[PDB]
Amino acid sequence: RVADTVGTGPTNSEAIPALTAAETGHTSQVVPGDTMQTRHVKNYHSRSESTVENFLCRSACVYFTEYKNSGSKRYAEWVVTTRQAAQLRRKLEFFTYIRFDLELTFVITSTQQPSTTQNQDAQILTHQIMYVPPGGPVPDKVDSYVWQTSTNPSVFWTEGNAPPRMSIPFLSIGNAYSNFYDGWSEFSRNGVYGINTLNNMGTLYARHVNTGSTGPIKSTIRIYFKPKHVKAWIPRPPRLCQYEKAKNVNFQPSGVTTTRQSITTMTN
Amino acid sequence: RVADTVGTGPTNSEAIPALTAAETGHTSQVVPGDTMQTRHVKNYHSRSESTVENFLCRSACVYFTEYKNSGSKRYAEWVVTTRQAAQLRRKLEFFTYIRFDLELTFVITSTQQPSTTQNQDAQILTHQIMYVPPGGPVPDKVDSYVWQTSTNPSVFWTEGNAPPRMSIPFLSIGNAYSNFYDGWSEFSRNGVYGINTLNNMGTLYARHVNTGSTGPIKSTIRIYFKPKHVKAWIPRPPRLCQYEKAKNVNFQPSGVTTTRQSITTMTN
Amino acid sequence: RVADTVGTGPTNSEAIPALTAAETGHTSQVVPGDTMQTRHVKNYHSRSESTVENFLCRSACVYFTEYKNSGSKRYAEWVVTTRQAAQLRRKLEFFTYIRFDLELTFVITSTQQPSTTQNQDAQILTHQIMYVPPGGPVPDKVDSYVWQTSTNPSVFWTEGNAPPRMSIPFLSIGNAYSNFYDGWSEFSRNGVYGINTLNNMGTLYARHVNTGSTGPIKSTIRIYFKPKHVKAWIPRPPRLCQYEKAKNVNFQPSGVTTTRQSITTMTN
Amino acid sequence: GLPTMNTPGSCQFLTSDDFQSPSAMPQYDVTPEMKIPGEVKNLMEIAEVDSVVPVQNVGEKVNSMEAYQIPVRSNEGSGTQVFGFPLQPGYSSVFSRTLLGEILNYYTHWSGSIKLTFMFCGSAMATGKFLLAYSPPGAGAPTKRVDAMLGTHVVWDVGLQSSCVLCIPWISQTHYRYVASDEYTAGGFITCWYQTNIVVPADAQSSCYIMCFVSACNDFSVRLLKDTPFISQNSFFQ
Amino acid sequence: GLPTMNTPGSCQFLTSDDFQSPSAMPQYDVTPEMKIPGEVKNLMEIAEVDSVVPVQNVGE
Amino acid sequence: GLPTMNTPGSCQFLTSDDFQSPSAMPQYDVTPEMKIPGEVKNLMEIAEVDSVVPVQNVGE
Amino acid sequence: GYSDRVRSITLGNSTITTQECANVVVGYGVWPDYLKDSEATAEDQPTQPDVATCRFYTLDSVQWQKTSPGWWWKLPDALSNLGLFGQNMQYHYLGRTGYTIHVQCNASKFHQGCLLVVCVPEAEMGCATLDNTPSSAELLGGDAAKEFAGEPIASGSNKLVQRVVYNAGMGIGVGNLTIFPHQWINLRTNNSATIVMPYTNSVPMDNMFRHNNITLMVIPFVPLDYCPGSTTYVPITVTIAPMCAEYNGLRLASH
Amino acid sequence: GYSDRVRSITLGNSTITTQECANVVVGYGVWPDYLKDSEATAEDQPTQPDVATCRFYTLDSVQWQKTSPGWWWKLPDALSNLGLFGQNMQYHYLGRTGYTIHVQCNASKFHQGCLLVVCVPEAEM
Amino acid sequence: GAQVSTQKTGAHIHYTNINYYKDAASNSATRQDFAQDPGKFTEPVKDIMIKSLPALN
Amino acid sequence: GAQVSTQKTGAHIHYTNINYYKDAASNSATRQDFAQDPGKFTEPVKDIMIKSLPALN
Amino acid sequence: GAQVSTQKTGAHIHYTNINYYKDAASNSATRQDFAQDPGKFTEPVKDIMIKSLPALN
């Protein structure tokens, strides 16, 4: 609950709250009462919306890819990593160390591709989503034994009903998801540099179980991340400069802020 | 519960309930018993239907818009405001100050547009509805990063199942939804005048997630408002004159009531 | 719960834990404390993932077959046996004697076959799955009285909704599902040799209840096995050599392990 | 065989929902937690930290360290103006890139007090007095010291203590204000005026600089989370 | 795994219905209420107020 | 007539799920259990057994 | 009694005295402490000298001119070549320590200026060219202060770090750097700045060579000014003292 | 603890801070107080805002040259054209108030001089 | 934690309600609040005027 | 084994929650943890500095 | 007749389970049976051999 102001009356004392020393590195907490007379106003406002859990707990689309029922690309492959979407990456970059569980929803939408094949009879498409942890086998082809998934987790979904959704625990060899890593892979100090060192989260594949019809059909899958039970450590300043690459923090230098007319202008 | 009449018998007293003074501004509450003999009739009738909650708690369609899978208009934009539908606006105008929560249901219906493209294979259309609060980004195009919705609320809906529905709390910087505002925006007294001053509720966009087929498909979305936990203050007289604009109360003068033959006619 | 190490300090005693006798057939359990000084580190790690139930309780696809609405093959026949899929067979071969209940899920996906028949009107296909125990009648034809299933268990499924799923108890005349059988059927010692002796689990048929349309439609069914309440006895060494046949353990001899440069190379 | 009935709103994908979901990896032994210093539990713990304000954002000054410095020199007159800006934390270019502003640009509404900490960065012999003023709306901005004197003002004397705090209170008609621009919820104007002068001894510089930090009071609140209009992507970065 | 059965009347949009619905904005701090004079709690409080009657509604 | 509402994630086939399912064969008398030596209850009981290491894996 | 501007700090066999200093800032409210037994992961016994490892090492001094943009230091790298702390972090595999930072810049009453001393944890820095990443010889300078730049670095292919000052190299507003523990040395009042950073990392122990946690940054917000007649060479000195240092995994010398 | 040279004064919505100030002089030992009922003569009810009327009004500044003889101000007249104190003393007939006087003149360590600030009551000239 | 209340039936039977969502703005519409106070709009005069009395004595 | 808790409503009603999945990582997001401690970032100095005191005596 | 048990969560909350089918082979998979006994495979010798002793005296 938000604090409430306390009523105050005219004062004339040597001690002065307003005058302090900002060189100490201390934020001087001054109630409006110190610099002017105030009346007792109770505050019934709450800080409920601000909490880290309510700020980060909203579904956001990390990446979307496409696959075709018949054609050169029959299966889709994506290395599961964040930093591909600016909206979520910026929100996560606020804290150096983060630790959260995750909820994943897959919005799969199909569409017909233009062709010349006649006598089309569309049938309910079925989509299989598979997750390969770092080290497992890779389906070099859309039809391969790897798709048996004797151990890997997978989800099958027929088109027409509610989207798939699963919950994922905190998968990390450390004690927190590091967002920034100022170091190299080799102790030699030569090699991969940056956060891409700590990205070994696996890969996610998707395919069509059954060929829908004779005419070509293209399906696009979108992946949504929902942080749950989130904990944040070491707060950091907000980005400011637009992102360029998804493997590092390389950027182009940009002005501190938008300019105005003069130093006494009240309008942008 | 409705009150019941009390039995009365012939009287001959100086005090007279019927004669009063209407200049005082007081409604003389006279039971039928005062002006004639009455018998004791118990009333089991109830005023349950009249209550403000039961009067305003019925779904009503505020606005409907259209978007096309392929074509110039691929996304729909609507500033969320009331006063576009006469049936609900008239009901709300009864009270100067209103305060209610809201339930929103979106009836999305698609249809095929006439064309010449052959070999059509229709696929389940998916519709995304997004709400941008006042200040957020705007999707200048149907395909844009804004549609990631990292913070904004959104709903995805595949065609074929029950319609979407969400509940919205009381969003207002004041303590009540003002229905009438006799003032300007500028303290200069020149500028926007009327209720349009207090309408900053945001915007609502909608789009097709996946192109359904080769042939053009047009979809229309209707929005329904359902007030919940409603409170009303300062009752007002009913409209009478038909509405003209959705930004003010400008009207064309109309007769008090429909006329009749004479002052002693019993028929319209 | 994982055990925790105990702190130790420099020692100089005749008794030596490191030196033992490996000819006895005993695994010398030596804590890191015996061969070097260690500090007291509590271990909060758990062995929950390893348990036999969590290792074998994951759905795995044993076999998939195809049937056509109109054509030479109108029904599918499969002898219910494991050892047709390498991923699950290898996992099961770890223990000589296994005893588990089973959960079966059937992913049935249809597709249209290319043809010349015009004016196609696709209709919801219905799929019937039937299990014939060893000894029952066999549907020599897709249309036959056997499909009445007055006693056999069966499942009917219309295309468009969630996949079928059933639970099966422990069906065996013995006390455990034997995985290896070093013997013959005849006491003469001439005849079927190996594990195929103990495979009399029945047969599983599947058919289309209604012809979908005029144009040919091919449907493929995949069968998934999910072990429940599993118990394992007599642990065995892992396969190593790729499987060749599904009726025995015949194999082609393969090298112990992949080679390297020399005996002091640190890289593959 | 329990007879049920689905209601409108079934089989939908609402973004800001909170339900339960079956886990893809059952019986996972999570890595235990450890004590890491500086745990955040609420975003208003970041808004209460002082943030350097770029008051001098004029032209090219935004592309150097000269944006955070406010020039003050020994004048030949008195009563002139040093700087001024509107009270628009989530909109004005002055407060847009401050930590407080960066936090506010995520939430539609805001309420509470503000604390402007001014630090004089001149020599040790230079003395002076300044008049900080906050004038609520109703009229235009003040143009002369006789007009900003009537607002809420705090005279500041430069001395041993080199830091002064201006507590902009909460004087409004509505419980909350919009972070976006709206004339219905105008904020006010913050103006600083020379009180007497800036006098220096011989062989000391007569042109000094002042810095300003913005922070929120113990009674700050935010509401209605929205997307920020600052970050944008043309395509998926790769 | 509770076995259920949908009844006639499912997945419909009835106008005068009263059910529960997930909120689009969770954990919202509603602006507190204040005392505003003249609160209406029933429409028959308006019907009991005198209203001028246009008895002479003849022609112009 | 209990009004419900399906959530995202319905009518899906998740691989590593744990629900209940109606049995195809009701009232089955399972063959009783017997004591068979060497019962495994955890895979780390196999990892704690000595395994010969092929250190000299050079060429042939 | 006494005043708050005077402070004395003793560590190992070294002492630091200040007569015009502000209040010490102690990290995020945590004083550096040894690794508890309910948090460790290495089963080996650690080594803790706590005298040779923990002491005030004085680095090289840099000159503060009227056109100086700022300097940055890496705490693990700077002390890697100085004393037994360097020898130990070199002979071991895992190390753990907190640090005490003291910055000394003194000027008379007729000078003016202001410095920001900030300890940024995990300061990943962007390269000048988007495709390449910075090299190990450009990012960290052993016992050397890498200076910043007033104007943007060229975008031509190179392994140079983006040294533009108004973005701090990490791509942020230099104004919002305050969120981290920081001190202000204004030549009007303060003559020194003290910071006490605990061990901030996502693991119990990490290798010092391939991971530099904290990056001290000094930024002159308000430039230095004076009139002719005053001394123009005003240096800046930085003294770093390790605290509660321990190690694990004794291995053959590695450099 | 603290020193006596630092002082802060708050009145209405205005504040005055000084870091090198001497001890405040409080008139003839009497702090200004409202008119008691055993001393009044007007039988009408008085009006007392005490917020708009009571606050630090800053007047115009004058330059101190090497040949400046001095300056004088009249407290009722100076504030007659500034804020609600001016509006009230203009719309009424009888007024009553005490005054707080603050004079600010700052110079470095290398200047010299001395000023006398005196409040003369009833200064007929 | 269920709430049992009465049903609105004719004149001259308990129903059950459970809240599932934790926002307090998702509850069903409260329809049974049959309370009134017509003293604000009708008879709003300062001095009480008894029914059978000369309103203006 | 149900858990009854309070709803987040305005100022100036209990809801029911039951856990069905046995992984403890499938529970709903815990949204009501309104606890704070701004002493780590603001006023982080070693020696306490009272508000109305000469910060540097 | 419900069964309340504990959830598998991290180190350093009760869930509910009800059986609906009456075959006892339809229950959910029992995943929490963390019991072991490595004495059968490791150290299976007839005569006990203490750790720090000459295995062959």
Ligand SMILES: CCCCCCCCCCCCCCCC(=O)O
């Ligand atoms: C059908 C597939 C189900 C399982 C899919 C799991 C994919 C996500 C794996 C965990 C990723 C957690 C986030 C890592 C990135 C980060 O922390 O920045």
Ligand SMILES: CCCCCCCCCCCCCCCC(=O)O
């Ligand atoms: C998927 C979008 C969900 C959210 C949509 C919210 C749109 C409505 C916002 C609140 C409007 C309340 C009514 C304001 C107008 C009035 O009171 O007259």
Ligand SMILES: CCCCCCCCCCCCCCCC(=O)O
């Ligand atoms: C609609 C059909 C339902 C019944 C289908 C039952 C098919 C499976 C029968 C039991 C097989 C159990 C496994 C035997 C093989 C093995 O143990 O290795």
